[PDB]
Ligand binder design. Structure first.
Ligand SMILES: [Cu+2]
Ligand SMILES: [Cu+2]
Ligand SMILES: [Cu+2]
Length: 439
C-alpha cells in the first residue's frame, strides 16, 4: 500500500556485511527542491546497515569528496584501532573498516564523519547513516510482532542548490536548518499496519534538539543510545539531543491520524547584538514547534501487552577513580573548552586503566546545552542535575544544560587512544574535545 520513506537496509548475510560506500556529492530531489548534498551510497540518509552480534562488518569507504574525511562508528564499543578518529582519508583514497559486532550489543547506532575541523560541514551536508544491531531479545512475543521503523531526525538548510554554508554564528551555536526532515523527507505520513510500533529514533542533526511528543499517546522507552532498558519506561515526551538514539514502543489503541511533533525547546542558542563598539550574545529562546510526521493507525487496533522486562543491566565493580571535566565557552570567539583547554590531537588529557571503572563528573559551566559524548566506552548515567537517572541502560551521549553536572559510571573496555567531546559538532570542531588513553 503506502510507502513511508525510510533508508534502504543492507543486511549481513552469512555472518558478513561487506559493502563499498562512496562519500560523494549527490544531486537529489528532496522537499520539492533540487540540491546537491554529500551522501554515502548516493542516499540521504545513507543506507541502514543491519547486523547481529558477532557479525563481521567490512565497510570500504571511498572518499570521493574534495576534502579529507574519515568514519566514526558512533556508539559501537569497538577498538579505537578500528574506530580511529585520528585517521585522515585523502580525497580519492579508500579505507576498509573491519570489525566484529560485540557479543551482547543491541540497539540503534550510526556512522558519520569524524575528521576534526570538518565534521560540522560534512555532517550538515548529508553524510550520515544508521546501524541497527538485532538482539535475541527481539524474538520475545511482546516484541517479535511489532512493526519496526527507523526515524532519522536530521534538519537541513539549502542555499543555491547546496547545503547552506556555515556562518560565524553557526560555529558559535551549532547549525540548525529550516527544513526539519524525517528520513530525508518533509512531514511524511506513516500508515501503520500493526498496532504495536517499534520506532528506532536517531538524532543525526548537527545541533537541533527534538523534544518528541506523539499526539494522544505516551511513548514506552525500551532502549537508550547503546542498549535496552531493564523494563519499559512510560514517558509523555522524549528529548533527543544531537547524537542520541532511543527506541520506543507505541501502542496504537484507536483509529485516527496523529502528529509526531518536536515541541518547543530552548537549548541556549544565541543571537548577537552589536551596539556601542561591543558585541553581546543574546538568548534566542525556545524552538518553534515542528511537525515531524503524521501517524495513521490501522483498522481496529489491538496492541499486545508490553514486555514485563527487557534486559538486566550488568553488575559493575566499584569505581577506582573519579574525574572532573568542566565545559566552558568563549561565545564571541566561538571557542569551546574542556578543563580550560581546546582540543589538541597531540595531547593526551586522561590516562586510565582497561578493566577498571571510573566515575566522570561532567560539569557544564557554559550558557548553552552541551551533549557530552565518549567514544569506545559506553557509560551509565547515574545522575544529572543532582537527580538520579530514571532508568539503567548504556548511553554514549548525555545532555547537560547550563550549570548541570552529570555523574557517569564509565567502565574502561578497549585499550588505546580515543576522544570525548561535545556532540554539537560545531563546538567539537571549535575545540570542545579531549583525548583519553586506556592502557
Ligand atoms: Cu557521533
Ligand atoms: Cu557544545
Ligand atoms: Cu566523536
Amino acid at each position: 500500500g503506502p510507502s513511508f520513506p525510510e533508508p534502504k537496509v543492507v543486511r549481513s548475510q552469512g555472518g558478513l556485511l561487506s559493502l563499498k560506500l562512496s562519500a560523494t556529492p549527490t544531486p537529489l530531489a528532496i522537499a520539492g527542491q533540487r540540491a546537491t548534498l554529500l551522501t554515502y551510497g548516493g542516499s540521504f540518509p545513507g543506507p541502514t546497515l543491519r547486523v547481529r552480534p558477532r557479525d563481521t562488518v567490512r565497510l570500504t569507504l571511498e572518499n570521493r569528496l574534495p576534502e579529507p574525511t574519515n568514519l566514526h562508528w558512533h556508539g559501537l564499543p569497538i577498538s579505537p584501532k578500528v574506530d580511529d578518529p585520528f585517521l585522515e582519508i585523502p580525497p580519492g583514497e579508500s579505507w576498509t573498516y573491519e570489525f566484529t559486532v560485540p557479543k551482547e550489543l543491541a540497539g540503534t547506532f550510526w556512522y558519520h564523519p569524524h575528521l576534526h575541523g570538518r565534521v560540522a560541514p560534512q555532517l550538515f551536508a548529508g553524510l550520515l547513516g544508521a546501524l541497527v544491531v538485532e538482539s535475541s531479545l527481539d524474538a520475545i512475543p511482546e516484541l517479535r510482532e511489532a512493526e519496526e521503523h527507523l526515524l532519522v531526525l536530521k534538519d537541513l538548510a539549502l542555499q543555491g542548490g547546496r547545503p547552506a554554508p556555515h556562518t560565524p554564528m553557526d560555529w558559535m551555536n551549532g547549525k540548525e536548518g529550516d527544513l526539519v526532515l524525517v528520513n530525508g523527507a518533509l512531514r511524511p505520513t506513516l500508515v501503520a499496519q500493526k498496532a504495536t510500533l517499534r520506532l528506532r529514533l536517531l538524532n543525526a542533526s548537527n545541533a537541533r534538539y527534538y523534544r518528541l511528543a506523539l499526539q494522544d499517546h505516551p511513548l514506552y522507552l525500551i532502549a537508550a543510545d547503546g542498549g535496552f532498558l531493564e523494563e519499559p519506561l512510560e514517558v509523555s515526551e522524549l528529548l533527543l539531543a544531537p547524537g542520541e538514539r532511543a527506541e520506543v514502543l507505541v501502542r496504537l489503541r484507536k483509529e485516527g491520524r496523529f502528529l509526531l511533533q518536536a515541541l518547543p525547546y530552548d537549548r541556549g542558542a544565541m543571537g548577537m547584538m552589536d551596539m556601542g563598539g561591543m558585541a553581546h550574545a543574546m538568548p534566542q529562546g525556545p524552538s518553534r514547534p515542528e511537525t515531524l510526521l503524521y501517524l495513521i493507525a490501522p483498522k481496529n487496533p489491538k496492541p499486545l501487552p508490553l514486555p514485563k522486562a527487557l534486559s538486566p543491566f550488568p553488575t559493575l565493580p566499584a569505581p577506582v577513580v573519579t574525574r572532573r571535566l568542566v565545559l566552558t565557552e568563549d561565545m564571541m570567539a566561538a571557542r569551546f573548552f574542556i578543563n580550560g583547554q581546546v582540543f589538541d590531537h597531540r595531547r593526551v588529557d586522561l590516562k586510565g586503566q582497561a578493566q577498571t571503572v571510573e566515575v566522570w563528573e561532567v560539569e557544564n559551566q557554559g550558557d548553552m546545552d552541551h551533549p557530552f559524548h565518549l567514544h569506545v566506552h559506553p557509560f551509565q548515567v547515574l545522575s544529572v542535575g543532582g537527580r538520579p537517572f530514571p532508568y539503567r541502560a548504556w548511553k554514549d551521549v548525555v545532555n547537560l544544560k547550563a550549570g548541570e553536572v552529570a555523574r557517569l559510571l564509565v567502565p574502561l573496555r578497549e585499550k588505546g587512544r580515543t576522544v570525548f567531546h561535545c556532540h554539537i559538532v560545531e563546538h567539537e570542531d571549535r575545540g570542545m574535545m579531549g583525548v583519553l588513553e586506556v592502557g
